[PDB]
Amino acid sequence: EAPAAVVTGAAKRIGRAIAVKLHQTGYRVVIHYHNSAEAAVSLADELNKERSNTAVVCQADLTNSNVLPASCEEIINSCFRAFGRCDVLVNNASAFYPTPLVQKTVETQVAELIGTNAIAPFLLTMSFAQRQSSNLSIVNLCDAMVDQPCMAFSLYNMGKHALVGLTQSAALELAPYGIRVNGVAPGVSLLPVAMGEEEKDKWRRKVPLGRREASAEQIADAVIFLVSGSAQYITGSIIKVDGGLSLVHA
Amino acid sequence: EAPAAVVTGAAKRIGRAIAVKLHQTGYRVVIHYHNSAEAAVSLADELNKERSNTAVVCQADLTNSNVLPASCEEIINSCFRAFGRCDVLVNNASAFYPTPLVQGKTVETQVAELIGTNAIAPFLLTMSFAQRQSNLSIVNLCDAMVDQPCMAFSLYNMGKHALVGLTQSAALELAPYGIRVNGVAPGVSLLPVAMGEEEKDKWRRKVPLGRREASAEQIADAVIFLVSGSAQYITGSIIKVDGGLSLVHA
Amino acid sequence: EAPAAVVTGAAKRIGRAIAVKLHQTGYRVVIHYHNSAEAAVSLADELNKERSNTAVVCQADLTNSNVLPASCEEIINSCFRAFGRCDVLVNNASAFYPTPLVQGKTVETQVAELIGTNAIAPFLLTMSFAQRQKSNLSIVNLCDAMVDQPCMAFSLYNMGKHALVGLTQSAALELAPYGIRVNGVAPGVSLLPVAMGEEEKDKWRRKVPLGRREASAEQIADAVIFLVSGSAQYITGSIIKVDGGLSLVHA
Amino acid sequence: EAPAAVVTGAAKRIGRAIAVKLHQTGYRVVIHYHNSAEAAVSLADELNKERSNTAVVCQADLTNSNVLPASCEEIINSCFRAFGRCDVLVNNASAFYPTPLVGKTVETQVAELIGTNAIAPFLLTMSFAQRQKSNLSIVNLCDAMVDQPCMAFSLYNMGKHALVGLTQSAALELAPYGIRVNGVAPGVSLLPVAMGEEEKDKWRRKVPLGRREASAEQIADAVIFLVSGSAQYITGSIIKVDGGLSLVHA
Ligand SMILES: NC(=O)C1=CN([C@@H]2O[C@H](COP(=O)(O)OP(=O)(O)OC[C@H]3O[C@@H](n4cnc5c(N)ncnc54)[C@H](OP(=O)(O)O)[C@@H]3O)[C@@H](O)[C@H]2O)C=CC1
Ligand SMILES: NC(=O)C1=CN([C@@H]2O[C@H](COP(=O)(O)OP(=O)(O)OC[C@H]3O[C@@H](n4cnc5c(N)ncnc54)[C@H](OP(=O)(O)O)[C@@H]3O)[C@@H](O)[C@H]2O)C=CC1
Ligand SMILES: NC(=O)C1=CN([C@@H]2O[C@H](COP(=O)(O)OP(=O)(O)OC[C@H]3O[C@@H](n4cnc5c(N)ncnc54)[C@H](OP(=O)(O)O)[C@@H]3O)[C@@H](O)[C@H]2O)C=CC1
Ligand SMILES: NC(=O)C1=CN([C@@H]2O[C@H](COP(=O)(O)OP(=O)(O)OC[C@H]3O[C@@H](n4cnc5c(N)ncnc54)[C@H](OP(=O)(O)O)[C@@H]3O)[C@@H](O)[C@H]2O)C=CC1
Ligand SMILES: Nc1nc2ccc(C(=O)NCCc3cccc(Cl)c3)cc2s1
Ligand SMILES: Nc1nc2ccc(C(=O)NCCc3cccc(Cl)c3)cc2s1
Ligand SMILES: Nc1nc2ccc(C(=O)NCCc3cccc(Cl)c3)cc2s1
Ligand SMILES: Nc1nc2ccc(C(=O)NCCc3cccc(Cl)c3)cc2s1
């Protein structure tokens, strides 16, 4: 038949764009969600209606507990269960909020920010590999502004730095098994829904390429390339998709 | 009207694969060469037979000198003369040889060739490209190993480092003009002309992903992505196409 | 009075050498240890015999847990309790072992120790150090020069060391308005593993361009000493590799 | 007896502070200069007043041309003829001005910005290494902001990137001879004399640590460390001395 992909947090925003675009490219997909049951279902609906029985949903909480392992195993599972194979893993799901050094308790923050951002990708990676001709690859959602961090976002930043480390080490380690591991690093994309609107323009104006944020589909485009046969020799690479934002000094 | 691209050192090896593949994507192509007259003319005949009036050649020495700006201006001008437009510039041409710090070319010539082709020509070509200015982009052929260099290749490495700087500086500067500037960084690809079987397998053995060098087409694939509509928010980015080679410790 | 420093995992190897050199430069020192009780007490004994009332020990597991914040707070408080001040924090303590992806400690346990010691505890200690400030304040984080060219099957260790880089940068940024500098020291190959054979040692030694030998503990401490000194008063968010060229050598 | 150090562009500003700190440390110094003869002599006289026969001056243009190799050989020679040895080389001299891609000629700009910042350091490095017959080191003055460049500084940035490559390449190659090679990367240091205080403050306010530029002495302090017995294992390292400026996003 046709290849299959798991996308994490695929309900909304960047994950949904990735999901749809993988589908259009001919992937059967698992739409993982935590909170967005509705949205997951609706997207599955839309993809199933397009090609019969090619989109399934999956619940899991990706916080750092004692049960993350099983959850990550569950997610990889259902991809094999629904489609009998798993070609692609997109690590998209992610928490993001400030954690000031001079001031949810901390370990909540750690489980979410370190847990979702780093540890869960590590576990999914381990399951994806464990259960493996083909074109297998993993794509991690990184952050182009990792070296010029937002003030008071240490934990978030630590977790994204950790994700670069996983990208590198897993690319090395899984290269023998023909599994590629890559990253996509957005700058400013879909801005926080809560963040002010006139405040949003402030950020848009800093971006060299067209004074605007990346659309979700732009991010998705890079993911598509990395999983494709056009990237068959690409592993351990992180592709920034930031419109030049990371090149701009203070 | 199909867009137009200049590829430097497009007569052989990776440059040829980039020109071919731009052509197969719908571009008209200026094939720059220095010495490889026959291969140059040969390729253009092949492109033109495939689609008449779609390929030209343009001879130029890319060694640094007081007339390199005029030679660079001429390469770009050749594209406007042939095709009435210049949409893409691929900085591919490259001198590569050892320049030990501790002891037939003079050092003046070594600097001219290694710094001229790898860095100064790209800069002058970028300047000419932007001056004569849809989906405009420049792709620089960089080097994935530039922070773990070959022993005794200081001038080469300096040139490739300079090219990274050019990639970033021009991406920043040319963004408001809608011109994107990116790089592709091979690890080990098409291997040298003068090298034994034993030595090839030595290098190949180092590559985590499949224990082999990149095909030129694999390198060309990333160039294709960067110039395409799928990369319209990507600028100042360098994509490693190295099979994990740069991840491998001594 | 004399400034005070907290050094984590300071009973042996690189931490001890850092504690010793800070002590010789006139610091009062907290020697944090986990398991190495005899060795920590021995070191403090030596340092106290050198100038009385200048060295204390402090026991803490730096494995991630819900009590890890309390333990890190307690480490910092030990310094204020002993010496009335805390000028320098060195995050040296580190777990180091393989965690293969394609496969005995549970994975829960691996994550707790490798991410906890190498990254979370540094963050918590960073927080406690800064909050307790109410001179030349700085933090030095022991990083790893080979993080972008890692050992096969050391995913979690590498992830923690990359996190520590992120902490170094983020904390340099956030704490600079308080006058606290935050930097890193990144060894290549230094003191080899106690359980490693001399045969394997020489394999690693011969890869080092500068001298074909590992860094001495002193040489690593030397860089730490520079970063805390007034010769580094404008330096923050910098990581100095002390690796003999090792990270420049290709495969 | 006393070790000897060559410092380039040592007449004024940062190179001056380095010469002085090296002298105070016990070094005999060659004060290289291009135009500031008056400045160079006064420094030399003052140093020589502190300690007889410990300081000499040497004039040379470090621009790129067929005579540059000879010039750099002569600079190194001047240390040996004066002091009988050359233990340290500090590549400090630098040209810095904008070179927009869109009243000097372009070839002149290339010659000056690539010549002073990259090529002359390479030639000096070669001459330093070849003339050796303990604690030998080279320190290259880099730039902490090379990945977040000033707009329209492409050539400057290319030169500073090249210098990073030299540092790394020469570190690797000279390590067997026991010559360490490292860099110091200032952020904002001595601001131009004639720059308005109101402008100066715009840059000053960007700096996290103390909201001021680095003194020349602070930069020199990092140089002193790298040449010292405390840095005996450090090679191929670049120490940013930037007060956190490079960590600050747009
Ligand atoms: N937005 C931007 O501008 C930038 C984004 N990025 C990165 O790109 C990726 C996508 O960003 P964006 O779409 O804005 O992300 P969001 O912050 O909106 O989160 C995306 C999804 O993550 C899931 N998620 C969050 N926390 C958990 C958790 N504890 N367990 C399980 N799932 C969880 C949610 O799924 P559910 O809805 O089902 O609960 C949510 O829809 C992230 O990795 C992010 O860090 C990086 C830099 C810039
Ligand atoms: N091959 C590999 O494994 C790797 C290559 N790269 C990079 O990828 C790109 C393509 O590599 P590859 O195809 O191997 O390159 P080649 O070594 O085959 O050279 C490409 C072309 O550069 C041209 N060139 C050389 N000197 C001059 C000069 N003075 N003036 C004008 N043109 C000149 C030549 O044109 P002509 O033949 O007409 O004289 C030559 O065919 C380069 O920029 C290279 O640095 C990066 C790392 C790995
Ligand atoms: N040695 C080398 O070659 C290199 C070292 N580094 C870094 O340099 C630093 C020093 O290296 P090195 O001296 O070899 O380190 P070690 O591996 O010897 O560990 C130092 C100390 O870490 C402490 N530690 C370990 N696990 C825990 C834990 N769960 N809770 C609390 N403390 C713990 C131990 O204290 P105790 O003995 O009391 O149990 C130990 O003595 C480390 O951060 C390391 O990663 C970087 C690269 C190379
Ligand atoms: N100051 C700052 O904020 C920053 C500086 N840096 C780097 O720090 C180093 C020192 O900085 P700074 O003191 O401000 O530098 P300056 O701009 O003051 O230049 C230092 C010296 O360079 C010499 N020089 C310039 N062009 C030439 C040439 N063609 N031939 C020979 N010598 C030449 C001059 O010698 P003379 O006067 O005798 O002609 C000059 O005094 C440089 O390498 C610089 O790039 C990096 C980032 C920031
Ligand atoms: N899960 C999520 N992770 C992230 C990470 C980053 C952002 C984000 O909005 N980043 C922008 C940082 C930035 C920094 C400086 C200038 C600008 Cl215009 C933008 C948003 C999100 S949402
Ligand atoms: N114009 C050209 N530029 C370059 C640059 C690099 C190479 C090359 O062969 N690079 C491989 C270097 C290498 C470094 C370490 C391990 C391995 Cl297997 C290979 C070949 C060329 S040809
Ligand atoms: N807590 C500890 N952390 C670390 C981290 C790294 C090392 C170490 O020995 N790293 C060497 C890795 C290496 C990789 C490639 C070549 C070589 Cl000569 C050495 C040893 C330790 S002990
Ligand atoms: N030879 C010389 N090289 C350089 C390099 C850089 C500078 C300089 O002024 N750099 C500051 C760049 C900068 C960029 C963005 C913000 C801020 Cl406050 C400062 C000044 C000089 S003088």
Residue numbers in the entry:
A (entry chain C): 2 to 104, 114 to 142, 151 to 268
B (entry chain D): 2 to 104, 113 to 142, 152 to 268
C (entry chain A): 2 to 104, 113 to 143, 152 to 268
D (entry chain B): 2 to 103, 113 to 143, 152 to 268
Authors' account:
For the Leishmania species, this requires inhibiting both dihydrofolate reductase (DHFR) and the trypanosomatid-specific enzyme pteridine reductase 1 (PTR1), whereas for T. brucei, PTR1 (TbPTR1) was shown to be essential for parasite survival and therefore its inhibition alone should be sufficient.
In the complexes with 2b and 2d, the linker is in the trans configuration, with its amide oxygen pointing toward the substrate loop, and the tail phenyl ring is located inside subpocket C. In this orientation, the meta-halogen on the phenyl moiety (either a chlorine in 2b or a bromine in 2d) forms a halogen bond with the backbone carbonyl of Trp221, similarly to I. Indeed, in the complexes with compounds 2b and 2d, targeting subpocket C, we observe a slight rotation of the indole moiety of Trp221 by 25–37° with respect to the conformation in the complexes with compound tails occupying subpocket D. Therefore, the conformational change in Trp221 appears to be associated with the presence of substituents in subpocket C of TbPTR1.
